[PDB]
């Protein structure tokens, strides 16, 4: 896997994946949502793997550690990082 290059969201079910950490325990099957299965029950602290990027609706196809595949709000997920420190860094941030 991991081809690289990148260009544009090709497929939201094969492309690179991102690891996020539920920012706030969420449950789609807690409301009248007629499509709770679509989403995923985020658990503050827990992590998930969202393949691709934002969806047409504006959700993340996070893949629960259990294998649960569904939508995921970026407002309830925090793109966690294993070990940021990777490169020696060449460029810095900008003001703003």
CSV table of C-alpha atoms in Angstrom, one decimal:
chain,number,residue,atom,x,y,z
A,1,UNK,CA,0.0,0.0,0.0
A,2,UNK,CA,0.9,3.7,0.3
A,3,UNK,CA,1.6,4.6,-3.3
A,4,UNK,CA,2.2,8.3,-2.8
A,5,UNK,CA,2.3,11.1,-5.4
A,6,UNK,CA,-1.3,12.2,-4.5
A,7,UNK,CA,-3.4,14.5,-6.6
A,8,UNK,CA,-7.1,14.3,-5.7
A,9,UNK,CA,-9.5,12.2,-3.7
A,10,UNK,CA,-9.8,9.1,-6.0
A,11,UNK,CA,-11.8,6.7,-3.8
A,12,UNK,CA,-13.0,7.0,-0.3
A,13,UNK,CA,-12.4,3.3,0.4
A,14,UNK,CA,-8.8,2.4,-0.5
A,15,UNK,CA,-6.9,5.6,-0.4
A,16,UNK,CA,-4.5,6.5,2.4
A,17,UNK,CA,-6.1,6.4,5.8
A,18,UNK,CA,-5.9,8.8,8.7
A,19,UNK,CA,-5.9,8.0,12.4
A,20,UNK,CA,-8.2,10.1,14.5
A,21,UNK,CA,-9.0,10.0,18.2
A,22,UNK,CA,-12.6,10.6,19.2
A,23,UNK,CA,-12.7,14.0,20.9
A,24,UNK,CA,-16.0,13.3,22.5
A,25,UNK,CA,-17.9,10.1,23.0
A,26,UNK,CA,-20.5,9.9,20.3
A,27,UNK,CA,-23.3,7.4,19.5
A,28,UNK,CA,-25.3,7.5,16.3
A,29,UNK,CA,-27.6,4.8,17.6
A,30,UNK,CA,-28.6,7.0,20.5
A,31,UNK,CA,-30.9,9.3,18.4
A,32,UNK,CA,-33.8,8.8,16.0
A,33,UNK,CA,-31.2,8.7,13.3
A,34,UNK,CA,-32.6,6.4,10.7
A,35,UNK,CA,-29.1,5.8,9.5
A,36,UNK,CA,-27.1,5.3,12.7
A,37,UNK,CA,-25.2,2.4,11.3
A,38,UNK,CA,-23.9,4.8,8.7
A,39,UNK,CA,-21.9,6.6,11.3
A,40,UNK,CA,-19.7,5.2,14.0
A,41,UNK,CA,-19.9,5.4,17.8
A,42,UNK,CA,-16.9,7.6,18.6
A,43,UNK,CA,-15.4,7.2,22.1
A,44,UNK,CA,-13.5,10.1,23.6
A,45,UNK,CA,-10.0,8.8,23.6
A,46,UNK,CA,-10.6,5.9,21.3
A,47,UNK,CA,-9.1,5.9,17.8
A,48,UNK,CA,-10.3,5.1,14.3
A,49,UNK,CA,-9.0,4.9,10.8
A,50,UNK,CA,-10.7,7.2,8.3
A,51,UNK,CA,-9.8,6.3,4.7
A,52,UNK,CA,-9.5,9.1,2.1
A,53,UNK,CA,-10.8,12.4,3.3
A,54,UNK,CA,-14.0,14.4,3.9
A,55,UNK,CA,-17.0,12.8,2.4
A,56,UNK,CA,-19.6,14.3,0.1
A,57,UNK,CA,-21.7,14.9,3.2
A,58,UNK,CA,-18.7,16.1,5.2
A,59,UNK,CA,-17.9,13.0,7.3
A,60,UNK,CA,-15.0,10.7,7.8
A,61,UNK,CA,-15.2,7.0,6.9
A,62,UNK,CA,-13.5,6.1,10.2
A,63,UNK,CA,-12.9,2.4,10.7
A,64,UNK,CA,-13.4,1.5,14.4
A,65,UNK,CA,-10.6,-0.6,15.9
A,66,UNK,CA,-13.3,-3.3,15.9
A,67,UNK,CA,-13.5,-3.0,12.2
A,68,UNK,CA,-16.7,-0.9,12.3
A,69,UNK,CA,-16.9,1.1,9.1
A,70,UNK,CA,-19.1,4.2,9.0
A,71,UNK,CA,-19.2,8.0,8.9
A,72,UNK,CA,-17.4,10.1,11.4
A,73,UNK,CA,-17.7,13.8,12.2
A,74,UNK,CA,-14.4,15.7,12.1
A,75,UNK,CA,-15.8,17.8,15.0
A,76,UNK,CA,-15.7,14.7,17.2
A,77,UNK,CA,-12.4,13.3,16.0
A,78,UNK,CA,-8.9,14.5,16.6
A,79,UNK,CA,-6.3,13.4,14.0
A,80,UNK,CA,-3.9,11.7,16.5
A,81,UNK,CA,-0.3,11.1,15.6
A,82,UNK,CA,2.0,8.2,16.5
A,83,UNK,CA,5.2,10.1,16.5
A,84,UNK,CA,5.2,13.5,14.9
A,85,UNK,CA,8.9,13.9,15.1
A,86,UNK,CA,10.0,12.3,11.9
A,87,UNK,CA,12.1,14.7,9.9
A,88,UNK,CA,14.7,17.3,11.0
A,89,UNK,CA,12.3,19.9,9.7
A,90,UNK,CA,13.4,22.4,7.1
A,91,UNK,CA,10.6,24.9,7.0
A,92,UNK,CA,8.7,26.6,9.9
A,93,UNK,CA,5.1,27.7,10.5
A,94,UNK,CA,3.6,31.0,9.4
A,95,UNK,CA,2.1,33.8,11.4
A,96,UNK,CA,-1.7,33.6,11.9
